[PDB]
Structure 1
Amino acid sequence: MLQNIRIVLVETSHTGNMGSVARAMKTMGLTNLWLVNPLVKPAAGASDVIGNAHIVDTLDEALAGCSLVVGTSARSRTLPWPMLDPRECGLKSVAEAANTPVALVFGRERVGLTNEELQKCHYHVAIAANPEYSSLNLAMAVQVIAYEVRMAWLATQENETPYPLVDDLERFYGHLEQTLLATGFIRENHPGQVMNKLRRLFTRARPESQELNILRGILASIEQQN
């Protein structure tokens, strides 16, 4: 359901952009706006969407609670990542929004999302723009994504069981870390690079709740070896 689909805006800084994003959302029937650390402070027509915008300081807080995280980027600035086109994105998002919150993440005008931020997404979506001019304006990008989302949703209004939330996955990663510290595989005050490798892997696998359960079972059993 459309109310479960979050438009997440990271550190947006041009005050007109927020209004444009809000109008785009509303026209597509989206309403659930999240602002990660806005450099401009909350003048348009879709006032409601912005008045009811969640604000948070960090990206993690916009993501915890979602089962599906999708980041947007014109080009890759990470190792190979699972990719969706905007159509596929719309389908997958509408499919999961029935039960759980979905985060569609958008970066800053001019500089976009960082590598670090992009690594907290389960999928990357690149709109297939003209290669010489492949960056759309933030609000435009939202328009495209939201339009595909509405297509998919409309299709469902044409007459399974949830995924773990980012929260659960994070608990599993904590458990994984402590296990690796225990066995000595990673060191005290590790820079988090091995953990990032493993997160890349499991993000691509995208564990279901029972799979996650089994994994933590295994971790638990290992720790009783010491």
Structure 2
Amino acid sequence: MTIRLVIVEPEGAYNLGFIARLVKNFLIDEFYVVNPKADINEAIKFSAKGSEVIEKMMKITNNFDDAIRDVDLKIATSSIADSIRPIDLERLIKDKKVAFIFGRESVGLTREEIAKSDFLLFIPANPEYPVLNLSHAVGIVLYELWRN
């Protein structure tokens, strides 16, 4: 069992640094970022000891296909506004290499990205306001994985 975190075209340097921190906090095995729009040098200021993740672990790809090679399962994420829940994860990911895919702050994921995913995970939240900030959604999912 190996977990790859894939972040697609992140825009906010704070979000990218916060995600890098979380990769260390929750011992995620692999970390890929597709065509980042955020300034990575600025992201490092938000990363605390996740700076090491940015510098040694993070793989930067220009295209989505190159971020999702050589895994057994791909799980995309979206809020209910735009399908499985975190409680489903343990059963699906047991003894698998799995990629968890998170989308852009402004626009989420494209049709390609969703087509290439096996499941779509939503974090239950206020139906009136179910959209979490990107890095907070990542943290919740990584916490759930750690619990397992």
TM range (shorter): 0.7 to 0.9
For the 8 Å contact 2:80–2:124, the answer to whether it is kept is no
Look up the match of 1:7: 5
More strand by share: 2
Give the alignment's Cα RMSD to 1 decimal. 1.6
Look up the match of 1:143: 139
Q: 1:91 to 1:24 in 2, by over 3 A?
A: farther
Give the letter for the 1:114 counterpart: T
Mapping 1:1-226, distance limit 5 Å: 1=1, 4-42=2-40, 43=45, 44-45=47-48, 46-51=50-55, 52-75=57-80, 83-93=83-93, 95-97=94-96, 101-152=97-148
Distance in 2 separating the partners of 1:55 and 1:129: 31
CA shift digits 1:64-93 (9 cap, x unpaired): 11111000001375xxxxx22112224433
Distance in 1 separating the partners of 2:17 and 2:91: 26
For the 8 Å contact 1:12–1:109, the answer to whether it is kept is yes
Give structure 1 stretches of 5+ with no counterpart.
78-82, 153-226
Give the letter for the 2:14 counterpart: G
User: Taking every aligned residue pair, what percent have the same amino acid on both sides?
Assistant: 35
More helix by share: 1
For the 8 Å contact 1:35–1:55, the answer to whether it is kept is yes
Give the letter for the 2:51 counterpart: S
Q: What displacement does 1:7 show? A: 0.8
- Secondary structure of the structure 1 residue equivalent to 2:99: strand
For the 8 Å contact 2:15–2:134, the answer to whether it is kept is yes
CA shift digits 1:153-194 (9 cap, x unpaired): xxxxxxxxxxxxxxxxxxxxxxxxxxxxxxxxxxxxxxxxxx
What is the TM-score with the length of structure 2 in the denominator?
A: 0.87
Q: What displacement does 1:96 show? A: 3.2
- Secondary structure of the structure 2 residue equivalent to 1:117: helix
Kindly report structure 1 stretches of 4+ aligned residues shifted beyond 3 Å: none
Q: What displacement does 1:34 show? A: 0.4
Distance in 2 separating the partners of 1:87 and 1:27: 21
What is the TM-score with the length of structure 1 in the denominator?
A: 0.58
- Total equivalences in the alignment: 141
Q: What displacement does 1:115 show? A: 2.5
Say which structure, 1 or 2, has more relative contact order (CA 8 Å, 6+ apart). Answer: 2
